[PDB]
Design a protein around this ligand. Structure first.
Ligand SMILES: CC(=O)N[C@H]1[C@@H](OP(=O)(O)OP(=O)(O)OC[C@H]2O[C@@H](n3ccc(=O)[nH]c3=O)[C@H](O)[C@@H]2O)O[C@H](CO)[C@@H](O)[C@@H]1O
Ligand SMILES: CC(=O)N[C@H]1[C@@H](OP(=O)(O)OP(=O)(O)OC[C@H]2O[C@@H](n3ccc(=O)[nH]c3=O)[C@H](O)[C@@H]2O)O[C@H](CO)[C@@H](O)[C@@H]1O
Ligand SMILES: CC(=O)N[C@H]1[C@@H](OP(=O)(O)OP(=O)(O)OC[C@H]2O[C@@H](n3ccc(=O)[nH]c3=O)[C@H](O)[C@@H]2O)O[C@H](CO)[C@@H](O)[C@@H]1O
Lengths: 262, 262, 262
């Protein structure tokens, strides 16, 4: 059901079953599939393709030539009714592609809120993007990739399959990420190696002097101490006792399966 | 002539002379030029541009914002009626570009069958792509490039002009291929260097233990022996006497003009 | 006002206020905003989006899925009426994006004449592209970037923000340009380092033997002499006294703010 306050341009095609919310904009030459849901104030500028079982939140700006909810590029996929979820206030730029998940991997590609997906950023099947993340021009996420909150992926950077980008991380431009990246760190190169802590980002987002200094100690324990991960895991866990921001490390370790970048 | 069982969406524009086959799908906002030929069961999802002298086979899936048969990016080209040929069951993804050839280079850009051209894969003028090849996201083929059967080109990989990618080759992601790549080998880096034989790929495609071991001996002769190519050419030629799979090397050598990656 | 000799395809949408010149082509499914100006003989093939305060010259060929004059990707931008200017005879290929400037940076994105912007070349806010420049497939210009005349930027090359690419420069493929690049030089790698003078380019464009030899002496003064820039600045300035082509260096030095590539 289409709300009586939403604008559907006479040239745009919206299939029956597609529920469009109040004050939404469906621009010219847009295609909205029968299983698609579009929320309040969400704008599809023009030439936008949204299909499949796709749920889209409120106040989103989806630009021209973007393809959302489309069939993924996994050879195993055979046409199963999988899902796509996008949050609120996301700025999805031109030629951006967000694909549906696969049955083998969970059946869901998930995108959070307040993110900026710059021109030709790709989000593959079964990916999970958090909140306020930035993917620059040509940033490619391979299958099953987690991008946690406030993480920034620079231009022409392919994050390899199954890899997890931690919270508040900044992967530099032209990088190749082959393994898991712990929260708060800078990653550059191909393959990507660590280059200290994102000291600027944490200062801008309002982290206290104690927290930033404690995070750097956790970084020193992980990369600079000379011990293995099993030895520094419980030492970080008790450093997190005083500083709740260091808990992001221990939570991340439980999810990490590809190992850390070194 | 359009077959009476093909679907042409009322918003799509098909020029007169364009021959569309039985049970083909021409989605909304698609443009099909007067010299275009589209075969049985071929689907153009939507927003697809097919122009020029372009021959397209059967059961193809061409996705949104793809541009096929278009004028190429060679400065020498002046508008000559050149050709494009695409085989069967090819999955041509979003924003993919396949261009027409040039008079100077043969006048034909050729694509085989059962290939997967992932998002924004570029096929330039006078290129020749074989069967069951895979070009990942942003994989760019420069002019006059041959990609032989079963070859895989990873994400954001530019194969330089005139270069030949052998059969069953796997060029890794973010690579730069400046020279010819012999069949069966793994290529990584920029510029791309060899990293052994694609042992996994050959096992999956059904090569015998003898053949894989013989191919590795041919690799050892080429890269690990310490002799030049002229010395190992006839030694490979008589190794191919027992093992027909090694003939792929000697056939490749006759076509190679840029030299091998080392 | 639309000229009575221009072709506006019945499916294309042109807003009121948009001034289209004589013998211009507005192809099917094109969108032209109310503040857009299109000159004589300019062709928009199809599926082209031109919006914002955008001035476009004569004899341009803008291909399918190109987005010109669009809102930029700067987080500071809030919707200010900024400007885009494109010159004459430019070949703007598929999926190319040229954005509007920002108030903070000057309010203007400027593109010269006779340029070739190959598939998916990005021109960000406040950029300045000169004449007869070439940006290959996936070449990304970040914000506030100057590209001087006859400069060539290869495939998948991100020129970082504020950087200046000198006249007659050739940045190779897959490169990362983090600093200013002096006129006449070859740049390769990531980050990009200098590799001599573009000797071929200068010979093709008609530079005299004396001028090319003098430019190479200026290169030798800058990179090979063993002195700092402040010591070689006035020595170049008096070398330019005899050879007017060396003046391009001293003019460039006044504009350079990020330092030279070394
Ligand atoms: C192209 C493709 O479908 N990729 C998916 C696949 O990747 P995955 O890493 O599993 O790659 P696949 O095994 O699917 O390989 C696909 C093709 O590459 C060949 N091959 C495979 C392995 C090898 O070492 N060498 C080689 O040449 C195979 O013969 C086949 O033709 O599953 C992942 C996990 O579900 C997904 O994230 C990917 O989206
Ligand atoms: C951009 C272009 O048209 N590329 C085509 C050209 O490449 P090719 O390698 O021949 O490049 P071109 O010689 O056409 O060069 C095009 C531009 O680059 C300049 N230049 C050239 C050489 C040099 O060493 N330095 C330099 O600066 C020229 O002045 C010209 O303005 O022919 C190849 C073979 O037919 C094709 O595969 C390419 O698609
Ligand atoms: C993404 C964006 O808007 N980029 C613009 C910004 O870049 P600039 O280099 O200024 O990057 P910003 O400071 O805008 O950073 C944007 C995001 O990155 C985070 N951050 C910033 C700095 C840092 O060292 N680490 C970090 O993580 C910030 O918290 C913010 O969330 O202004 C430039 C100059 O006007 C423009 O050329 C760019 O187009």
């Amino acid at each position: 059901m289409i709300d009586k306050s939403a604008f559907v341009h006479p040239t745009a095609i919206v299939e029956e079953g597609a529920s469009i919310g109040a004050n939404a904009h469906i621009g010219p030459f847009c295609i909205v599939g029968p299983h698609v849901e579009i929320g309040e104030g969400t704008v599809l500028k023009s030439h936008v393709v949204v299909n499949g079982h796709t749920k889209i939140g409120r106040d989103n700006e989806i630009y021209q030539f973007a393809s959302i909810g489309e069939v993924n590029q996994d050879l195993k996929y055979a046409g199963e009714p999988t899902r796509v979820e996008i949050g609120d206030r996301n700025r999805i730029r031109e030629s951006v592609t967000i694909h549906r998940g696969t049955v083998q991997g969970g059946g869901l590609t998930k995108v959070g809120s307040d993110n900026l997906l710059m021109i030709n950023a790709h989000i593959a099947h079964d990916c999970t993007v958090g909140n306020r993340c930035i993917l620059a021009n040509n940033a490619t996420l391979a299958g099953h990739v987690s991008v946690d909150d406030f993480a920034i992926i620079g231009g022409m950077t392919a994050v390899h399959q199954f890899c997890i980008i931690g919270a508040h991380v900044m992967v530099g431009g032209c990088s190749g990420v082959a393994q898991d990246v712990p929260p708060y760190v800078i990653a550059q190169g191909n393959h990507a190696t660590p280059f200290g802590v994102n000291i600027e980002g944490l200062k801008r987002r309002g982290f206290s002097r104690e927290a930033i200094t404690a995070i750097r100690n956790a970084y020193k324990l992980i990369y600079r101490s000379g011990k293995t991960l099993d030895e520094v895991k419980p030492e970080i866990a008790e450093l997190a006792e005083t500083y709740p921001e260091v808990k992001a490390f221990t939570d991340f370790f439980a999810r990490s399966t590809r190992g850390l970048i070194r």
